[PDB]
Amino acid sequence: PKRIAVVAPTYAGGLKKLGANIVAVNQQVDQSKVLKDKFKGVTKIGDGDVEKVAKEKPDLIIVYSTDKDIKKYQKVAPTVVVDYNKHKYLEQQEMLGKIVGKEDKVKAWKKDWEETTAKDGKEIKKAIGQDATVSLFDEFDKKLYTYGDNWGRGGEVLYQAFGLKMQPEQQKLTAKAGWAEVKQEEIEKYAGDYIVSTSEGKPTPGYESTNMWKNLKATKEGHIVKVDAGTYWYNDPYTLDFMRKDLKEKLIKAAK
């Protein structure tokens, strides 16, 4: 059970799921309700904390290719660079399986996930309707965004796994980069039948209290699904299972 220091938060959940002995993890995982709980008791570290990592005697240090302290981490233990692909969330997990030699266990997990979300999507569509469109909005640093299926934040579960229909303009605007900034006073142009908003637990945000927002058909019909921004930032198996249950449950209860 090698001692693994996970500097890149994105891979904490995936390596944890596969049984890795994680002795250090980037503090950012605490912004997630799911990962905060999974990693309680595990030493937290911040970018630049090379000595803290060293104190944990890691055998492998997991980092992003763009990490600037690689030249420093290497003096402590071999430093593993894992590809950062926002779109390929399932092969991200297969990459991690290669590190710990558990790629068949990943394939099995993958099969279960795809089949399960396929049926989940079907149940959801019987509820809200096959042609019901679902939008995704996320306020980040005073700026409003909308994502497609290849940018996480729940987009992979909504559009790739469940196979739910994206709002038309939302799909065009995000096709290119997978994301796109939105003008709050143009929100209506992207507002679908249902709206998934990452404002859960937050005092009603600014974009959710404008007269246009209040007049959206989804808002008036009670079709606004709020989710925890911090939790939805990740795409590891644990997080994926959570968003899966969380989105399925909220859409269905709000249905029609």
List C-alpha distances in Å: 245 to 146, 151, 210, 214, 239.
21, 19, 30, 27, 10
Check residue 241 and give left, alpha or beta (phi > 0: left; psi -120 to 50: alpha).
Answer: alpha
3-class DSSP assignment, residue 135? strand
List C-alpha distances in Å: 91 to 17, 59, 66, 87, 244.
15, 24, 19, 9, 18
**Cα–Cα dist 125/116, whole Å:** 14
The torsion of the CA quartet 120, 126, 130, 131, rounded to 10 degrees, works out to -120
Same-fold call for 1-85 versus 87-255: yes
Neighbours of 73 (CB within 10 A): 21
Identify the burial level of 253 via C-beta atoms within 10 angstroms of its C-beta, where 0-12 means exposed, 13-18 middle and 19 or more buried. Answer: exposed
Alpha helices per DSSP H over the chain:
12-17, 33-38, 50-55, 70-73, 89-100, 103-128, 155, 168-175, 211-214, 217-220, 237-254
**Cα–Cα dist 256/240, whole Å:** 26
Q: How far apart are the first and last CA of the chain?
A: 50
**What is the dotted CATH code of the domain comprising 87-255?**
3.40.50.1980
Please list, in sequence order, all residues whose beta carbon lies within 8 angstroms of the beta carbon of residue 53, skipping any fewer than 6 positions away: 5, 7, 24, 45, 61, 73, 76
For the 1-85 domain, the top CATH level (class) is alpha beta
SS3 readout for 149-214 = CCCCCCHHHHHHHCCCEECHHHHHHHHCCCEEECCHHHHHHCCCCEEEECECCCCCCHHHCCHHHH
Neighbours of 40 (CB within 10 A): 9
Say if CB 159 and CB 166 are below 8 A apart: yes
Q: For residue 119, which phi and psi values (nearest 5 degrees)?
A: -65, -40
Residue spans per domain, the chain: 1-85, 87-255
User: Which technique was the structure solved with, according to the deposited record?
Assistant: X-ray
**Cα–Cα dist 174/104, whole Å:** 34
